[model samples]
Target chain A: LRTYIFLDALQPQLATFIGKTARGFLPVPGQASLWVEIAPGIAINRVTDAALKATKVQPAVQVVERAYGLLEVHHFDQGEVLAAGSTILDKLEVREEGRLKPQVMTHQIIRAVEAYQTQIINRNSQGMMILPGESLFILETQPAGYAVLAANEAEKAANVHLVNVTPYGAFGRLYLAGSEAEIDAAAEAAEAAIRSVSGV
Target chain B: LRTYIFLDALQPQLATFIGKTARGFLPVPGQASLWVEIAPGIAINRVTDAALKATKVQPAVQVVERAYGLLEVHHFDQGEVLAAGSTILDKLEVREEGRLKPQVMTHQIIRAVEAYQTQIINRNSQGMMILPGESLFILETQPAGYAVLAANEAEKAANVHLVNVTPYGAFGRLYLAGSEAEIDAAAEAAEAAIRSVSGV
Candidate 1:
């Protein structure tokens, strides 16, 4: 809901964590939970207090399964199976609802998961999914690793104005296609649709 | 539309080329076209004639892009644009009056466009996105992968099902969340809503 490290904006931060992420954390030996691994060295801060604060505003999470990289998993949530898959990794379920900036939330979660996976690949020195997209604009010299983003439109367009820092390279140009009003309308429509479904 | 190749029921074929594929060619150079890529060791017949003994529908070639993916390219249809940063690549425009699907020629065209995108991602070497908490099996994979699906119910403690597959996956699943009677009512409500929106 909220982050201690206030990203100037969610679009930028979200683009950084789109493709590879997994919810349901293991806090204890036999526990599971929902949390975002902001990709170590990128930025990390607890959000429960922020989540609490968010109670006053639009607080929601929209999850998108964008194929930013190799999207190999297929979900079949059927009987005797909360989650059915070729590989029995673990199950992560949303009790209900899609309210936040869903397009952004889903898009970012995937990227964030992918980023964490990439770091693990680097740490393990194993081959990783070179997901079909550009690398992070941030230099590994800064964080000692690279990343791929799952950007919403505004964020993607933001790249157009990014000043390439030394050794950090270009992701691409941000392509804002519509006026701010149009984007706002789109978010409103999506939120309404979600509310209708979730009765929130 | 069918494919140049004849893949049969249970035939192991690339989802890209067989079921639904990007229309024209490889993501090759200078050719802003997208064709289905057949899997290794598979090929379509390339037969053009299909009147006397058409085993199925004729395979078609469909193309799509935002105004950005365009230039003087493709004779510049001056294709439509949606809100910037939409999770839905081209659907916003689709929902507009005189733009929604099921027109004389546009229904096929829209389906074709969706097929092209879906196949491209399916053919992608990277992983695919899988959602959580959705509990129905796709009944069919037609027209951008429609599937009739079934789910369990708590009140009745029986399996209930519905038939649909909207471009918006969330709608597709939720639309099928109730019993036959409720589902029929939902479908009626949806039809009425569509009629109200487009007046078609």
Candidate 2:
């Protein structure tokens, strides 16, 4: 019996809608999430290699590879996830890509809730925040721990929603949705957190 | 090199938007289209048998299976499609089923165009019509050819749009979208056409 698992990460604003991880996001306005299915299961070498290469520059939030034909890679950084995921696909001689873009097209907010508790009670759990009319900023940084620290520093630096934090994967993913001013302020905090982690 | 084809079918309202056959409708109000992907393909026995059985009662419009793990069965009837598709799944040792509902949600008409030319002239061509706010009825009749005759009878009987007429598959699929008065008139015309097909 093969096991199937879904792992996914969302840009802060869209995080509140779905309750799954390791899955793909809506294509409109396109976000990047990687999914690869393998039957009978296999070694995680190619997948790990891609994660390491992509995480060298930015962090990856989560990954899912089970007994079934499924491999998923996710990150807040658009470029890194695609680049990393493509490496695996390229090696497999297969082609399945995700939508990546800087702006979102469908901005209609079906529902919005702030500072709510997530049912999943863990470091990856219990946070709700969304950007309404403003923009959302994502940071893919190295060392899952650094992402959490950066998110902590960011909220203190500016008023931003700490949507999600994944700090134990091969890489880390952070999401923040806020006004332009707040995002600009929070981003500075995130970069500074990363700088401190690897010696300026 | 393997070719991947995406065939989708929408209920009357959504059908006019994107066109495809043997695909399931949006889940808002489940429109019963059964899609099953079988790895390395199957004997097509149970699948084909189910199709034949279901078509005998309902007008099952289309069925597709090929060299790969792909089996798509579409129907105008909700209960029969789900019941039949699940039989294929149950036998294949597969588990992927969609919601089977009696009502469809999200009925807002973004735009409605009549008598428009479909760009895909081959199988994808044939043009696409739509259902207005009144009543939308679809029929998948037997003898395949009966669908075309029914469509002809429908257009002549009332002011309903012949969104599509698929008459070459295992069964025939006919669609009509119009006001209350026209739908009743057209449905009767459709039934009359079916009765004529076989007296077989």
Candidate 3:
């Protein structure tokens, strides 16, 4: 109720907390996100702790005290589960409709790698694809901090350019460029990352 | 369409380019957005220079070359303007519609300021009414920079707690807690800030 923090994906602390209290917050959704609400004089972890203790299985929830609450541990294994367990989080499950999803905003391509060889050819090119005659892809996803996984899997699954991947938000997104063949491979991996998560 | 750098809002240098080229790119739509394209060998400033001199009246342009282009200089005042002046940047107008606009994702509030005192109590709590009945408002918005503009204007207009504001993105958002009387005033000012941009 005080500090409303929304993480599109779970943070390490959340992961640790969920792992510790996995059973209480389990069956996380296919794309489980982390939300935190806090009051004064309380650490974020404590808030999560209280939420974890409140329920055996936290569904997509909204915790409220008279004035404030923290985003404790709520994990939805399925979007359906979130729907079914609405009352767990809200007695009056009020949803925010007409929301937008993450997307690719601005994009550019270096037809030939030599043109921007030194630009993206660094240690940080893990999430980007660089292919001669192919292209570099940069996408910005909302809710931040989820693209690192996408980039990692994309690189492992494909022979692509991993220019950069920024997965922390306000908004979470990535940058990569590669050949058509590698790009396809990377795309498959990235899509898979989104469709079916790797785990906490 | 190879390398894509998605900036939630224009940085100072970028703003400089856009402002100088504003005349060339005026008559923008209500939701005028900024984008840039770049190549390997060329620096961004050079690309912007080329864009600046390409036309007497830039006419909302796009720049394309085999090697480099400056998103630093390109501005789509109106999506329509970019459509009208195709050759300014490319041989053919290539458009990608699958882009996400900045937005406000979710919101929260604490009914009483004393309920969570030290947390949100700081210098700016003017345009808000800290009543025990109201809740804090936390929200996310597209185009990150606008939030600062909103918070600044909100404080000037009302007595509210400026919990937090992030004007950079994949997503841009903020947190404000205050009484209904103050929140209403702050909301109007914030909305007006969005309605009438504060320059670049």
Error of 3 at B150 (Å): 24
Give TM per candidate: 0.22, 0.25, 0.31
lDDT by residue (tens digit), candidate 1, B65-182:
2110110011011121111101121222222222222211011001111221223222321222212222212211111111111111111222322222222111212123333454
The TM-score leader among the candidates is 3
Candidate 1 lDDT, A22-73, residue by residue in tens: 1211012111112221111111111211222222211111112211111111
Taking the tens digit of each residue's C-alpha lDDT, what string does model 2 give over A106-129?
111111211111111112334553
Error of 3 at A139 (Å): 2.5
DockQ of every candidate = 0.01, 0.02, 0.03
- Between candidates 1 and 2, the one scoring higher on TM-score is 2
B1-200, model 3: which lDDT tens digit per residue? 22222223333322332333332343222223334433331233233333334432232323322233324222434443343233333532333322222233444444544635633443333223334445566555444434544555666677676655544443446667667777767777666555553221
Ten-residue segment with the worst summed lDDT in candidate 3 chain B? B57-66
* lDDT-superior candidate, 2 or 3: 2
Rate residue A140 of model 1 by lDDT.
18
- Interface root-mean-square deviation of model 1 in angstroms is 17.9
Q: For candidate 3, what's the TM-score of chain A, rounded to 2 decimals?
A: 0.40
TM-score of 2: 0.25
Candidate order by DockQ, decreasing, is: 3, 2, 1
Candidate 1 regions exceeding 4 Å error are A1-63, A66-200, B1-200
State the TM-score for model 3.
Answer: 0.31
